[PDB]
Amino acid sequence: PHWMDPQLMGSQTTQYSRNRGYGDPIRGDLPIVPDDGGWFATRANPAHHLHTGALSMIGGDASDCGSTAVQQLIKKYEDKGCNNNGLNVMSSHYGGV
Amino acid sequence: MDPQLMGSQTTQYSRNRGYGDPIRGDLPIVPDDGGWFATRANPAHHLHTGALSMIGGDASDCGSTAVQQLIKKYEDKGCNNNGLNVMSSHYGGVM
Amino acid sequence: WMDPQLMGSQTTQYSRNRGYGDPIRGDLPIVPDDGGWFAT
Amino acid sequence: VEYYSLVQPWYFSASIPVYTGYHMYSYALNVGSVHPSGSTNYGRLTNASITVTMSPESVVAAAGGGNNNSGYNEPQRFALVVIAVNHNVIRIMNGSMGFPIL
Amino acid sequence: ATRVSGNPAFGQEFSVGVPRSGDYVLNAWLTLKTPEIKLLETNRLGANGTVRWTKNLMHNAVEHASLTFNDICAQQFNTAYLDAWTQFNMCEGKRIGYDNMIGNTSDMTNPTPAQGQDGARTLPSKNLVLPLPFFFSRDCGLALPTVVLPYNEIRINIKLRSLQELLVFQNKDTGNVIPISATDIAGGLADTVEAYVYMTVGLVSNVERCAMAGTVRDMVVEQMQAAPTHIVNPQNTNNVHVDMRFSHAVKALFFMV
Amino acid sequence: GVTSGFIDLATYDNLDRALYGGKDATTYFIKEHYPVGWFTKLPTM
Amino acid sequence: TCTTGAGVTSGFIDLATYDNLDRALYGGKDATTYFIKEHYPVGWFTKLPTMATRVSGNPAFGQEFSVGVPRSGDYVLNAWLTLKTPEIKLLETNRLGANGTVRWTKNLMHNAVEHASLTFNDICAQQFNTAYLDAWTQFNMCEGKRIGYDNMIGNTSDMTNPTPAQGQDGARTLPSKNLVLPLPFFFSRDCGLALPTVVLPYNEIRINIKLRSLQELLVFQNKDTGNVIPISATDIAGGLADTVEAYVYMTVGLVSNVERCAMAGTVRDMVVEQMQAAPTHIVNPQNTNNVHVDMRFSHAVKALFFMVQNVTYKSVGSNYTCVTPVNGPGNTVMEPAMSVDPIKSASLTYENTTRLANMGVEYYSLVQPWYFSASIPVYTGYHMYSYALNVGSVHPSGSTNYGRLTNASITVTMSPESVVAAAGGGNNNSGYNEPQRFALVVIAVNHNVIRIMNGSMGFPIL
């Protein structure tokens, strides 16, 4: 039952450096391993030097959802084979490169 | 007329596709059928696929879930002798 | 109490749609629409 | 008329109007409640009517001849309006919206 | 909101679509900027003529406001229903705010004499907001699954009223009202009006946003039914019988002459 | 737009997990409905 | 039939109307019914008021006094401060002479009560001031209690009525009546959140209140030109009473012995709401028409209350209008010819990502309070933006934590009325006769978690 327990009882969240602000809010910072040494080797901490981005929750394409279930549904549903009353249409792919 | 009949044309999206979310694609919904007040909408030109494929994708190297291991591995963690027991912020994202 | 009120049984009452029917000869016997989508 | 004007809003509403008119009769315990309360559907009911008896002030103001800055300097006309509020059910499935009861 | 049908003008009807990219739309309000009114010395009533905005500038000039899906008439509200609802279900504390935000500021309803008279006050020009009462705006638990409804087209149609009946032209002596004319006021009557529709959307985490997909959902909503108006002549008769006809489970009946 | 919505959705931490989140966390925009009794009322002298 | 006075058959035809649509709403074996209220037992408890013993000096205007919270109870759930105003007697020998009036400032309480803080041992857990008090009382005010609150805190049309000198027609004495201000705290927000004095035997609970000097509480107006100058001891008879008597009354509760020892020795987590104020920023509409303020907050903010406060005269307070009030007819204060909020439009930016565009001032003034609050302010100013569905609800709703958020900024566009009132040139009794100055204030309300264990409190997340 010491005095001033509340100040020393608990924990505080990590505080980020001013460099973290420049990171892309949507796309997380690229994972780059820091270097060490005694010659101009900055030992910056990625924990408060990297930005995780906003993609972590929105992305994932687990089973349904995302940009794969809709891809499969569109590919299955859109019709193929001749045109008859028309001039033929090709299937446009929405994949990445 | 041979050059005209040669080849095809790109798909024609309906005006409803322009109201969708451009960043993240809208949810895949199977259209209903029937002869009573049922619309046979075509998802191919009625849905928006979003942009979660060109910039998105959980790559082996890139990805927030790939930076997570780096952050945890290089985090000091434990209890320190010169601070106030800094707590590990957890990103996750499970609602 | 409540015996006079709950002893009886009221007669059926028809909707206003029946008032437009043919009095001399009745309407044709047709089954009604049943379903969970725009079904009366 | 004071019944609909004051007594009904006192019990089955969240407020009482501050102007003349606006007569209410509610079958539900709370008008503003989204959750359904007591109500009678008029589709199964046969024809229903409302009888209204008007005040002598209206009949003596319908004819003109009033002096200046009295409001009824000219003949006055009236029109009765009736509004009801009802519940309904909406079903969402297969990316479509529609009533399941029609 | 991206307007795609017509243009906002007094006396015309314009439609606005409800876009996706939200998850649950739960609030909609129409903002409209009133013009500048300046009485002229050439009015027919001359000195004995005053011009003032009508009572409930908003809740007027907005009638037959409808919400529809695809091409089916879904729900509608009008002036009398708006007045009854805002007179009966008004929450105290917000009453002053509403009676200041829908007009009725005692600066637009105060008569203004002509230019040559002692009172040369002009009717101020400002913008007013009317929150559209819809089933989704009634409660936070009722919201449109916009992502789950990609195969429809939600439309909101607003039909404004002409500027002729929005301005009361009173006579200072006999208390008579006559229709306004373009030459009565300076600058004419601007038929075009400046107005927009704003909506509030909600965003949710994907893990449940697309876990709620592919399901059937049921909602309970409230609509109105307005009987056609009946002309009443107290001179001939004192008692009037009016027969109604409604369909669904009526909750309450509002009436007034 | 919705980029700002994504930005302030991405702000998630331990306090946010303590307050919101969880598999059993009841969400808004979805109101459960339960049946009530069937009754009627009318004034009487 | 008959439909006599005691008629009941008319409802049977209404009951008969039940087919295919009311089956979904009513009916069912599991359907609940009205007219049968379920009764459940509750706890056994009593409550009574209790004086709080002073610990640091005596109350005095312009000074700070501290009072220790009375322990040995079971739960503390109300606290309020009562203070008796002095007696004001104008003198004909005042500096302003005949053309001079003295009156109490608008909102006498919420002024001379600032930096009201609650401390556990030697660490602060909550602190509020004038701006937060005004915003909260204008946005979360239950109707019917407005007149009572006005009588409690001043502006009762009697304290703030200008009084001319003794030799003039108006020689009324300003009454010396006691005023009561409830203290909004996390334990006072709801009865569910109450301080466990039985579970806190080791911590010491203290409340610090700092008053304001009497010089900056009396409006010394000029009768004709509407000029405000600081008051002096020789201006009024009897001098200035620097020392005043003030009491803090606190309500404590008691619980049954069965539950007093049942919950002893447990780890408890409580969710509370607190405030945090951005540093003031002087606004000069003459140079630039836009003003940007950086918001640097930490925890899960719930709403942001902002306004622009006229700061021309220190004597006048709670004036968020471009023109200061002046004396009017009938020895009553009246609003000047023009009285509008200096804010025209505002926007929010998240590091070059504008979350909220250049929306009009009427949005924050009317649309936001009408949807996500319990009341709409009746005075000009007091704009808000709430991330939560209901501000007044203690239960957490939608919110964002600024700790992981980058530098956020708020931008405001000035108004033509403010930019013309900033310079002088106003005529007599126009209010803006002298040049006007404005300042911008930003308030944030956020959530936090407090843990009780081992007979002590603390913040597990800091």
Residue numbers in the entry:
A (entry chain t3): 73 to 169
B (entry chain s1): 76 to 170
C (entry chain t2): 75 to 114
D (entry chain e3): 362 to 463
E (entry chain e3): 53 to 309
F (entry chain e1): 8 to 52
G (entry chain e2): 2 to 463
Give passages from the manuscript.
In one ASU, there are 41 MCP capsomers, of which six are in the pentasymmetron, and the other 35 are in the trisymmetron. Similar to PBCV-137, the structural alignment analysis revealed that the N-terminal residues of the SGIV MCPs are conformationally diverse and can be grouped into three configurations (NI, NII and NIII). NI displays a hook-like shape, NII is perpendicular to the capsid surface, and NIII is parallel to the bottom of the capsid. Based on the information from the cryo-EM map and proteomics of the purified SGIV sample, the penton protein was ultimately determined to correspond to the VP14 protein, which is a polypeptide encoded by the orf14 gene and harbors eight potential β-strands. Each VP14 protomer contacts two MCP protomers from two adjacent pseudo-hexameric capsomers. However, the AA sequences and structures of these zip proteins have not been identified except for that of PBCV-137. Using the method described above for the SGIV penton protein, the SGIV zip protein was identified as the VP38 protein encoded by the orf38 gene. The atomic model of VP38 (P1) shows that two VP38 protomers are interlocked into a dimer, which may contribute to gluing two antiparallel MCP capsomers together. The space generated by these missing residues is occupied by another mCP (P2) VP139. The TmP (P3) of SGIV corresponds to the VP137 protein encoded by the orf137 gene. VP88, encoded by the orf88 gene, was identified as the anchor protein (P5) of SGIV.
Singapore grouper iridovirus (SGIV), one of the nucleocytoviricota viruses (NCVs), is a highly pathogenic iridovirid. Here, we report the cryo-EM structure of the SGIV capsid at 3.5 Å resolution using a block-based reconstruction method. The cryo-EM map, combined with viral proteomics, crosslinking mass spectrometry (CXMS) and fluorescence colocalization assays, enables us to identify the major capsid protein (MCP) and seven types of minor capsid proteins (mCPs). The atomic models for an asymmetric unit (ASU) of the viral capsid constituted by different copies of these capsid proteins are further determined.
